[PDB]
From a paper:
Boc deprotection of this intermediate followed by acylation yielded the final compound 3 (76%), bearing a single thioamide at the left-hand side. The highest affinity compound 3, which bears a single thioamide conversion at the left-hand side, revealed comparable binding to the unmodified ligand 1, with only a small twofold loss in binding affinity, as measured by both techniques. The presence of the thioamide on the left-hand side of Hyp resulted in Tyr112 bending slightly to accommodate the bulkier group. An increase in hydrogen bond distances was observed for compounds 2 and 4 (3.0 ± 0.1 and 2.95 ± 0.05 Å for O–H⋯SC groups, respectively) compared to 1 and 3 (2.52 ± 0.05 Å for O–H⋯OC groups, on both compounds). Substitution at the left-hand side amide was tolerated, while substitution at the right-hand side had the most detrimental effect, highlighting the prevalent role of the Tyr98 hydrogen bond in molecular recognition.
Hydroxyproline is the key recognition element of small molecules targeting the von Hippel-Lindau (VHL) E3 ligase, which are of interest as probes of hypoxia signaling and ligands for PROTAC conjugation. The modified Hyp residue is crucial also for the recognition of the hypoxia inducible factor 1 alpha subunit (HIF-1α), the natural substrate of VHL. Herein we report the synthesis of VHL ligands bearing thioamide substitutions at the central hydroxyproline moiety, and characterize their binding by fluorescence polarization, isothermal titration calorimetry, X-ray crystallography and molecular modeling. The new structures revealed that the noncovalent interaction network between the compounds and VHL residues was fully conserved and consistent with those observed with previous inhibitors.
Author numbering:
A (entry chain B): 16 to 47, 58 to 112
B (entry chain C): 62 to 202
C (entry chain A): 1 to 104
């Protein structure tokens, strides 16, 4: 498949399917093959990437949907990232 | 506008909670007022008596987060074919990451301290604008 | 059955899926397409254990109920710099801050 690179503020390079990243309108704008995020640390951006997989697997599905887990320690930062990324 | 039709035609239904939440069934009565019904614990079922044309929706009993019933917002009991009950499969939706984050932040921070959180003011309003059945009845209408 | 993985080396992390019945070698071919290094220059790991090319991901403990979309299983990756293989090194993610008083 076609992949894209999402880079966290601390230098972790997350490689995900283009389709998965294009779920975020912000990322689509930033691409129109790499994107640097100056404010999103790796412990938040990894969870963002896991959300893409979750959403694509469970959107339009009969199989029972599990809760998307978010630890209390990362919830505030993840909220801010989700607001920026619009997802 | 959104109200149950006073049909008086019985319809037997199974409320099946296939979610990790405690479920609050809400019946929209003949004047459109939401009536709360007893809760269903996670993974549990109740065989209940309702009627054809009646409107139901389903929420998290603690937080009022929206839930889906047969992949959609509203459930309306249909005709029982072969005497068998209609199944109401209550599930989690695929929440946005933003709304899921808001749920977790609401579960940890008490309403008084949303202002004290170091975030943009619009998120403070997103937190305070918590899920509410009256708002979604205006949305669905 | 689909299994959902994070393939990780140094500060690199690939999110992808594969079949439970697919092989370790076939996963190296996925890594090859993404990072442009052939299978012979790759070592794949479950924790400290080196994985054999012929074995299925299911045989190596990557099953659909442990390697989930919301919580994927980690596969370690190490490259051969010309002569010899580097040691397995996975840089940890950043640490979360303290919970603020309001959340604490
Ligand atoms: C004349 C008329 O239709 N009156 C309404 C108030 C009636 S009798 N309703 C409205 C809905 O169609 C359901 C029906 C009703 O109240 N049935 C009794 C009932 C009692 C408990 C429960 C529930 S919901 C979760 N757990 C239980 C035990 C469901 C139905």
């Amino acid at each position: 498949m076609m992949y894209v690179k999402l880079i966290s503020s601390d230098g972790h390079e997350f490689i995900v399917k283009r389709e998965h990243a294009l779920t975020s309108g912000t990322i689509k704008a930033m691409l129109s093959n790499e994107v640097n995020f100056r404010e999103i640390p790796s412990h938040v951006l990894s969870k963002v990437c896991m959300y893409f997989t979750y959403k694509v697997r469970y959107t339009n599905s009969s199989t029972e949907i599990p809760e998307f887990p978010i630890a209390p320690e990362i919830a505030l930062e993840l909220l801010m990232a989700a607001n920026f990324l619009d997802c | 506008v959104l109200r149950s039709v006073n049909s008086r035609e019985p319809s037997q239904v199974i409320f099946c909670n296939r979610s990790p939440r405690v479920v609050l069934p809400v019946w929209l009565n003949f004047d459109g007022e939401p009536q709360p019904y007893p809760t269903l614990p996670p993974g549990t079922g109740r065989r209940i008596h309702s009627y054809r044309g009646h409107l139901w929706l389903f929420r998290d009993a603690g937080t009022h987060d929206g839930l889906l019933v047969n992949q959609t917002e509203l459930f309306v009991p249909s005709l029982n074919v072969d005497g068998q009950p209609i199944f109401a499969n209550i599930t989690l939706p695929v929440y946005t990451l933003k709304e899921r984050c808001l749920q977790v932040v609401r579960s940890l921070v008490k309403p008084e301290n949303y202002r004290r959180l170091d975030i943009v003011r619009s998120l403070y309003e997103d937190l305070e604008d918590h899920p509410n059945v009256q708002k979604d009845l205006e949305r669905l209408t | 059955m689909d299994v959902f993985l994070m393939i990780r080396r140094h500060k690199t992390t690939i999110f992808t899926d594969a079949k439970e019945s697919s092989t370790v070698f076939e996963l190296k071919r996925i890594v090859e397409g993404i990072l442009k290094r052939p299978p012979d220059e790759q070592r794949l790991y479950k924790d400290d254990q080196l994985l054999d090319d012929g074995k299925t991901l299911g045989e190596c403990g990557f099953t659909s109920q442990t390697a989930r979309p919301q919580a994927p299983a980690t596969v370690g990756l190490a490259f051969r710099a010309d002569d010899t293989f580097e040691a397995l090194c996975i840089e940890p993610f950043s640490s979360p801050p303290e919970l603020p008083d309001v959340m604490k």
